[PDB]
Symmetry: T
Subunit: 154 residues, 12 copies
C-alpha cells in the first residue's frame, strides 16, 4: 500500500528526527556512568550542538524552499522515525553508545534517501547540505563503532 515524500516533507521529517536525536544525546550524556564518562560526556555535548546546528540548518533550508517546519514537540513526536524511551533501568556505556550508533545509522540511511530524492527533484542546495551532514555522520559512525570495538559497517 503506498505513500510519497518530497524535499519539503523529507526536510520536515528530519527537523522532527533531529529534535528527538538531540534530546537522546542529552539523555546519554546525563545518564552515562563508567570509566569513559569524561570523554564521552564531552563528546555528547559536542554532538548535541552539532546535531542542533544540523536541525536549525534543515529547518531554515525548509523555510528557504517555501516550506513550513514542525516547531512543537507534539509535531516532532508525531513525525519522527527516530525512537526515544525514558531512562529507567541502568544502561552500560556500550548500550548507550549502541543506541547512539543505531540512531546515527538511521539518520545516515534516511539522509541517503534524502540525497537521492533531492537529486531527482533537482534541489542541488538541499542535496549538498544533506551530503555534508552525511559526511559528518559517517565519521561519527566510524569513531563510535571503533569505541565499541567494531568496524564502521559491522
Amino acid at each position: 500500500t503506498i505513500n510519497s515524500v518530497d524535499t519539503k516533507e523529507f526536510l520536515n521529517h528530519q527537523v522532527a528526527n533531529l529534535n528527538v536525536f538531540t534530546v537522546k544525546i542529552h539523555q546519554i550524556g546525563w545518564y552515562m556512568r563508567g570509566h569513559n564518562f569524561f570523554t564521552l560526556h564531552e563528546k555528547m555535548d559536542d554532538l548535541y550542538s552539532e546535531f542542533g546546528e544540523q536541525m536549525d540548518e534543515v529547518a531554515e533550508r525548509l523555510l528557504a524552499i517555501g516550506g513550513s517546519p514542525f516547531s512543537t514537540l507534539k509535531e516532532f513526536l508525531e513525525n519522527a522515525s527516530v525512537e526515544e524511551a525514558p531512562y529507567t533501568k541502568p544502561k552500560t556505556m556500550d548500550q548507550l553508545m549502541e543506541d547512539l550508533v543505531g540512531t546515527l545509522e538511521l539518520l545516515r540511511d534516511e539522509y541517503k534517501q534524502g540525497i537521492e530524492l533531492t537529486d531527482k527533484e533537482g534541489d542541488d542546495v538541499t542535496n549538498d547540505m544533506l551530503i555534508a551532514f552525511k559526511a559528518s555522520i559517517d565519521k561519527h559512525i566510524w569513531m563510535f563503532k571503533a569505541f565499541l570495538g567494531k568496524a564502521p559497517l559491522e
Copy 2:
C-alpha cells in the same frame, strides 16, 4: 484538593519547560515576518542558546542532587506548564513577541516559586542558580516589553 513539589520535582519540571520554550523560540525565529525580522531573528537565536544552556544547567544540577532528569520529548510534553501550539495562521511580530513575553513571565513566576522552595529546603546552590536565571529573564522581560511599547510589569 492537594499536591507537593520538592527541589528535584521543580528542577525536572523546568527541564520540561525549557525544552518546550527553546522549541517555541525557534518557531518564533523561523516564522517571524516584518520590518524587525533581522534583529529579532538574531535575538531568537541568542535566546535559543541561552535557554538551552539554562536547561542543561537545570538538568545537570538535578543530576548533582541525585535526581533523574526527563530526557524524552514525551516526558517534556507530559510535564511542561509552558504551552505550545503549531504555527498555522499568520502571526504579527507583536503577537509572536507577546507569546515570547508570556512564556518569559510564566518562567519568571515559576522560578520565583522555585527560589522560595529551594530556600525552604536549604538547597543554596539550586537557589542561587535559579536567582541568576531569573535575573536574565527579568532583563529580557524589560527589553521585550519595551519592544512592545509597554512597561516591564504592564
Copy 3:
C-alpha cells in the same frame, strides 16, 4: 553559453550587484536604517567575495575574466539605475530581493550547464553560492512581510 561565458557573465553581474548594495546602504532612510545599513555592508563583502571566487575560478579553467567597469556594464543582466527620487526602505529591499532572485535563477542555469559540461568544481561553487542567496531571499522576503517564493 559555456561555463567560461557563464562565469564571466556573473563577474559582470556581481560587480553591478555590489555597487547596487552600496547604493542601497548609502541612500536608505527610515527606522530600519542601522540594522539594514550593516546588512548591506555584510552583503557587499559577501558578494564581493563571490565575485572574486567566480573570477578566480574562471582563471583556473583557462578563462579571461572581465576586469573593467565598461566590460561589466556591457555584459551584466543585473540592472542599475542612479539614485534620483527618494525610495522607501521596502522599495530598496524589493530591488535587492529582485536582484537576489535574478542571481539565484541565473546560478541555477549555471548549475545545470556546469553539470552538463562535467565541471564538478564550478558546479559545487555555484551551489554553495545559491545556498547563501536562498537564505538571503527568505530573510529579506520575511523583512518585506512575504513568503520566500511569493
Copy 4:
C-alpha cells in the same frame, strides 16, 4: 575662550551627553528598541572615551579639567531634562541628533580657535571627533527619514 576653556567646556558637555545617552537607552520603547538600545551603549562608550581624551589633552596643555557633576552642570551648553512624560523613539532620537549637532558646531568653533592658537594636537583631536559626530548625524538623521543637514 581659549583652548583650555574650550576643552574644559567640552568635558562638561560630554558628561551631560553621556548621561543623556543613557537616559535615551534606558527609557526608549518601540519596535527599534534592540538596535537603538545597543546603539546607545556604543555611543555612551564612544563619547565617554572622547570626554576622557578631552580632559587628558587639557591636562597635557597645563589645564585643570572640571571633575565634579556641579562643575559639569554649571558649565555645559548641552541641556538635560528629567524623563517624565513618555517620548517616542523619534523624539528621543531628535534629542540625540540635536545634541550631536550642538557638539559638532561647538567642535567646529574649537577647531577654528585651536588652529588660530597653533595647538595642532588639540586641533587634530577635535577634527577626528567631529568626523565621528558627522557620521552619527548622517546615520541618525537617516533613521529619522531625513537628510544629514535637513
Copy 5:
C-alpha cells in the same frame, strides 16, 4: 526606602563616584602615578558598569532611574568637591577608600532591605558588587599601609 528607591539612590551615587574616580585619575601626582592612574581607569569602567546594571535592574522591577546630573546631585549621599588645593596620592586614595566604604555600607543596607522585600535578584546583584568593593577596600587600604577595616 524600598528596593526601587535604594537602587535609584545608587544610580545617583555611582555617577558621582565615577566622576570622582576620574578626578583622582586626572589630578594625581607622585611616584605611583602610572599604576594608580591605570587603576582609576579600571575602577571607572567597573563602577560605570555597576551603575548601568543597577539602573537596568531598576528598570526590570518597574522603576524609573534618575537620568540627569541634576537628579544625581540632588539624590547622592556620595560627596564631591572640585579639585582646588593639591592633594597627596594618599589623600586621594583616602577619599577613594572613604567612598568605597560608604558604598559598601549602603549596599549592606540594600542587601538587608532587598532580602526583607524578597527581591532575590537585586539581593544577589548587590552582594556581587559588595564582593568587589570589599576586595578594593582591602587593596587600597593596603596601599595606604592599613588593615582593610582599620
Copy 6:
C-alpha cells in the same frame, strides 16, 4: 568557629587538596591516564583559584590567612598520605571524591555559619564553590559507576 576561622580552615584544606590533586595526577596509571591526568591539572588550577579567593576574602574581612605549609598541616581536616603502595585509578578517584565530599559538607557548614553571621559575600562565594564541587562529585561518581550521593 566564626567566618574568619572557617575561611582560614579552608585555606589549609585547599592547600592540602591541591597537593593531593597533584599526587593523583602524578602517580595515576591505567587506561584513563590521559583524560584523568588532564582533569587533575584542571582541578589543581580551579581549587588553587578557590584557595586564593578564600584567603583574599579572609583578608577583606580583616582576617589573617595561614601562609605556611606548617600552618596548613596543623589546621587541615583534609587528610594526606605519601604515595607508597600502587593504587588503582578507581582508588585514586575514590580518594578525590571523598575529599570533594569532605569539602562540600564543610562548605555547607560554612554557608550556614556565614548566613547566621550575615556575611552575604562570603556566603555567595562558598555557594558558588559548592556548585562546582557538586558538579565534580556527580561526574567523578559517574566515572566510578556510582550515583552522585551513593
Copy 7:
C-alpha cells in the same frame, strides 16, 4: 569643483582603481606572482575602504555619491583598459604606480580645496589617505628599481 564634487569624483576614481587592482591581481604572471597577487588583494581592500569612507563622508556633508558603474565611468579621471595583450609584471606595476600618482596628485588638489573651504574633517581624511598612497608609491617604485618621485 567644491568638496562635494571632489569627493564624488574620488568615489568614481576609487571604483575604477579597485577594479584595476583586481585586473592586475588576476592577470599577473611571473616570479613575483605570489607576493604581488597578495599585495593586490590588500590594495583592493584598502582602496575599497577609502572609497566607502569618501562616499560616506560625502553623505555626511549633504552630498549624493555616484552609486552606479555608469556614473563611475562617466566621472572618473582614472583610466581603464581591458586586458588583451600580455603585460609584464613591471608593466602592470607601472600602471598601478601611475594610478597611485594620479590619486596622490588629485588628493593634493582635494587637500588644498578642502582647506580653502574650511572642511577640516574631509581635509584630515584626504591627508591620511595620501599618507598611505605615498608609502605605496615608495614601495612599488622600489619594486620597479626606481626612486619614489623618479
Copy 8:
C-alpha cells in the same frame, strides 16, 4: 578500481606528494626562496590534511588505508626522485605543477567513479580537493609565466 581502491591510491599519492613538497621547500634556492619556501610549508599542511581526510573517509566506508611507507611507494602513481643535481626554482615548480596536474586528473577519475557508485560524500570530498588543486595550478602556472592549462 572501486571507491575504496581509488581512496587508498590517493593515501599513497598524497604521502609521496607531501614528501616531495618538503624536498622542494628544503632544496630550493634563488630570489623567490622566502615566498616559495613558505608556500611549500602551506601546501605540505594542506595536502597532509587531504591525505588524512582521504584515509579517514576510506575508514568510514569500511576500507583499510595503506599505513606504511612501503605500501605508499608500492601503490603511488605520484613519482619521486632523490635530490642530486641542482634544480632551478622553475624546474622545482614544474615538478610541483606536474604532480598537482596528475592529482587533479586522477581526482577527476575518482569524482566520476564515485558518482557512478553513488558515494555522494566521497564525491563531494574529492570535488572540494580538486577545487583547491585547480586554484594552485592557476597560481603556480602563473609563477611560471604560463596559462593554467598551457
Copy 9:
C-alpha cells in the same frame, strides 16, 4: 656517523614514525578510541614538526636531507609493518612506546656525538626533543599501567 649523518638518519626515522602514528590513530579500536585517536593526531603534528626542524637544521649545517620515501625506508632504524591482524589498544601503544624509546636512545647518541663535535645548536635541539619524548614515555607507559623505564 657525524652530526649530518645522524640528523639525516632522524629525518628518515621521523618520517617512518609519523606514518606509524597515523596507522595507530586510524586502526585503533576500543574504549580509549576518542582520547587516543586525538593523542595520535597531536603526536603526528609534533613529530612532523621535529622532522622538519631536524631536516632544516641539517640544511643549516651544510647537509642534504633525505627527501623521498625510498630514502627514508633505506635509512630508518624505526620499523614499520602493514596493519593486517587486529591489534589491541595496548599492543598499538606498546608499538608507539617502543618507537619512542628507540628515538629517545638514538637522540641520546646524537646528543653525545653533537657535544663531541661542538655543534651546540644541534645539541640543544636534540635535548629539547628528548625532553618531550621522555614526557611521552612516562605518560604512555602510565596508560599501559607501567613505570616510565619498566
Copy 10:
C-alpha cells in the same frame, strides 16, 4: 645526592616557595602594593609551573616525587615562617630575593650534578629555570636599590 634526589628536593623547595610568594602577596602593604601584589601572582604561577615540570621530569627519569605537605616540609632547604609581626615591603622583597638566591645557587649545584650524570634534559631544564631566576634577582635587587649580586 643524585639527579632524582636533587629534583625531589626542588619539588619540596618550590612548594614552600610558592606558599611564601602567596604570604608576601597577601600580607604586603605600602605604596608598591598594586605592582608587587600582581608580581607575586605572576611569580606564584611561574614557580608553580617550574615545580610541576621538576616533578614531571622526575617521573620521566623513573623517580617518585614528594606529593604531600609533610614531605615538602621535611625535605625543603627553603625556609618558611608564619606572618606575625608587620614587615616592610623591602623586608618582604629581601625574603623573596634571599629565596631566589637560594634556588639559583642550588640549581647551579643541580646543573653541575646533572652535567656529571649526563642527564642533558634535566640539565637544560634547570638552566632555563636559572635564567628566569637570574632575571628576577636583577629586577627585585633593583627594586631594593641594589646591584643584582650585591
Copy 11:
C-alpha cells in the same frame, strides 16, 4: 632646514632617544623599578616605531635617511652620556622628560616648517607624534610631582 633635513634630523634624534630609553630601563633602581622598567620598554617600542615612520616618510618624499650610528651621532640634538655615577629614578625621569620636551619643541618647529612647505602628510604625522609626546610629558611630570609645563 627643509622637511627632508628636519625628518633626517629626527631619525638621528629618535635613535639616540631609543638608546637612552634602554639606558634608563637597564640602569634604573628603586621602588618604582617594575612599573617604570616596563614603561621604558613601551617607550622604546613606541619611539622606535616613530623613528621608522619618520625614516619611511623621508623615503616617500625622495629623501635619504641617515642609517648608521656615526650619522645619528653627528646629526642628533638629543644628547647622550654613558651611565657612570648612580642616578636616582627621579634623575633618570628628568633626563627622559627633558628629551621628551626637546623632541616636542623640535616637532613643533617641524610642524610649522612642514605647514609652510605644504607637506600635509608629514605635518599630520608630526602632529600625531607630538600628541603622544604631550601625553607622556603630562604623565612623567606627574610622576615627578610636577605640572606638565612646570
Copy 12:
C-alpha cells in the same frame, strides 16, 4: 675577554646590526622589495630582542651594558657604512649574510668562553641565538643561490 666583556661587545654589535638591517630595508630596490623589506622588519625586531636580552643578561651577571651610540661605535666589530652609491638587492643581502656570519662566529667564541667560565645560562642564551642565526644564514644564502657555508 670574559663573559661580561663578550656580552657587552654583542650589545655594541647588535645595535650596529639593527641599524644596518634598517639601512637595507629602507634603501633596497628591485623585484624582491616586498618580501625582503618585510623580512628586514622581522630581523630588526628579532635582533633588537636579542640585543635587549644580551644587555639584560649582562645586568643579571653584575655587568654594565654599553648604552650610548658612542659606546656601540667604539666597541663593535660589526661594520657600518653610509648608503651612498646604489646597491643591488644581492649586494645588500651579501652585507646582511656577512654580518650574520660575523655574529654566528663571534657567538661561537662566546659559547666556548661561557662554557669555560661555567656560565650555563649565558651559554644556552647564545646557543638559542646562534640557532636562529644559522637558520637565517641558510635562508639568505639560498636567496643568493648559494649553499649555507659556501
